[PDB]
Amino acid sequence: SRVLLVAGGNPSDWPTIEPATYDYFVGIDRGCLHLLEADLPLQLAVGDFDSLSREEYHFVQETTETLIQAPAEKDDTDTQLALQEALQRFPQAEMTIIGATGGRIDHLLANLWLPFEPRFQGVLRQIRLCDRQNSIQYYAPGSYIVPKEPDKEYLAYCCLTPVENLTLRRSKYLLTNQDVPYPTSYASNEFIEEAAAFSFDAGMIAVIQSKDK
Amino acid sequence: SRVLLVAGGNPSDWPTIEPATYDYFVGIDRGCLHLLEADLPLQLAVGDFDSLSREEYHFVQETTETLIQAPAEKDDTDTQLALQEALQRFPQAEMTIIGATGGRIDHLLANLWLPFEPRFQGVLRQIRLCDRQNSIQYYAPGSYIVPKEPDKEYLAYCCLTPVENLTLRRSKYLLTNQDVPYPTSYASNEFIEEAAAFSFDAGMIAVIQSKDK
Ligand SMILES: Cc1ncc(C[n+]2csc(CCOP(=O)(O)OP(=O)(O)O)c2C)c(N)n1
Ligand SMILES: [Mg+2]
Ligand SMILES: [Mg+2]
Ligand SMILES: [Mg+2]
Ligand SMILES: [Mg+2]
Ligand SMILES: [Mg+2]
Ligand SMILES: [Mg+2]
Ligand SMILES: [Mg+2]
Numbered sequence: 001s002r003v004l005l006v007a008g009g010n011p012s013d014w015p016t017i018e019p020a021t022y023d024y025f026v027g028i029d030r031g032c033l034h035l036l037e038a039d040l041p042l043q044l045a046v047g048d049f050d051s052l053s054r055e056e057y058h059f060v061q062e063t064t065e066t067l068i069q070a071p072a073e074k075d076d077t078d079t080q081l082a083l084q085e086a087l088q089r090f091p092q093a094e095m096t097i098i099g100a101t102g103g104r105i106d107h108l109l110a111n112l113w114l115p116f117e118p119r120f121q122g123v124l125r126q127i128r129l130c131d132r133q134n135s136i137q138y139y140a141p142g143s144y145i146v147p148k149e150p151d152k153e154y155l156a157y158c159c160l161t162p163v164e165n166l167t168l169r170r171s172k173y174l175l176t177n178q179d180v181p182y183p184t185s186y187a188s189n190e191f192i193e194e195a196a197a198f199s200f201d202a203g204m205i206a207v208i209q210s211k212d213k
Numbered sequence: 214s215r216v217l218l219v220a221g222g223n224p225s226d227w228p229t230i231e232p233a234t235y236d237y238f239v240g241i242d243r244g245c246l247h248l249l250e251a252d253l254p255l256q257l258a259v260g261d262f263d264s265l266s267r268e269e270y271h272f273v274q275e276t277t278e279t280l281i282q283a284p285a286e287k288d289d290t291d292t293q294l295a296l297q298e299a300l301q302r303f304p305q306a307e308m309t310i311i312g313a314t315g316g317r318i319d320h321l322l323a324n325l326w327l328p329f330e331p332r333f334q335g336v337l338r339q340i341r342l343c344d345r346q347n348s349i350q351y352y353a354p355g356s357y358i359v360p361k362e363p364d365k366e367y368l369a370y371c372c373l374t375p376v377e378n379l380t381l382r383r384s385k386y387l388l389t390n391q392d393v394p395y396p397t398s399y400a401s402n403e404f405i406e407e408a409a410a411f412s413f414d415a416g417m418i419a420v421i422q423s424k425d426k
Pocket of ligand 5: 242260261262263264291
């Protein structure tokens, strides 16, 4: 199953959205207005909403089929929350996160690092960060094949941690049994034939496919 | 001493720059043109310059005073190369990298993990990356004062690695003796004074100051 989570970021940085392929639509704070003004469903609405006018928060209030209202002073970001909740409703679903990039970078990182958290690690394989130019997936140790997304021009293996014994095949550039001692971002690989593959014994890796301006 | 480096990003997303403050100007690929079309100096030109026309690259070759033209096929990104060259010439200068804004997240993380590289570790305290919206500084374990940037609203402690004993004061949000078991982005913190402070025993943190669009 497919859930789309929409954060406050600007919708111009959004990926190509095809609503037929999403089953549940979550709004985070301003993503709610953003989903709505985009003529897209709004099933869940999450956050403190302290970035909206009363006239906007009522609009959201009247439309979402479910409003989770948080305090302003809490631990979790609105987004950790939306993910926690959407995962309750859809424990095996693919979480496509959106509007979480293109601006503040301390906020981008907080999103890039969501799989790191115990409550999410279990579903790192379903957590998916997207914007017009990038497309990020997560992987724990193992052996995988990565099918090329059509619109993306480049491939990258970003080790978010020290990685052990990393081998890449079926891609313009290779590593065999490479040790990655500190976070390294093997950055501008390219696909050779519709799919590449890699294996590694330890750490985490964000697989980023992307394309230019 | 300060050195200023310019990647090929759109200059629209540049920080406000004051040139008096820099003693050396470094162009990176298409950033070489951005410097000249902004009536600023170009003293070091670096890259493979494949993004440039034959005519633009003729203009960058007459104007610069040192040209480093490198193979399109290398391990290093143009920016990795330019940084090492420039530190070769100014080993104690504070490197400010702007225009690293192209939008590709493999390159974003390529840049953000620079200090990790054994050839840059010895100067992490010297490396800065800046955006219209963002300003990034690196820290190894110690005790520090973090002077507020006048145009910025937010403060963030982005732990690039598991951090240990993270104490953090004079902020609008505190941690104290905090163990951070994996990468964690404590973002959207605020200054209460003109300076904040923090300390830690192990790992590496990227202090980030940011503001809204
Ligand atoms: C393991 C393997 N991954 C893929 C890389 C691909 N490679 C390393 S960096 C990159 C060069 C890109 O440099 P550039 O984007 O001009 O620099 P920028 O100006 O954006 O700083 C090449 C393709 C290969 N060398 N090694
Ligand atoms: Mg379907
Ligand atoms: Mg909020
Ligand atoms: Mg409100
Ligand atoms: Mg280039
Ligand atoms: Mg080389
Ligand atoms: Mg202390
Ligand atoms: Mg301490």
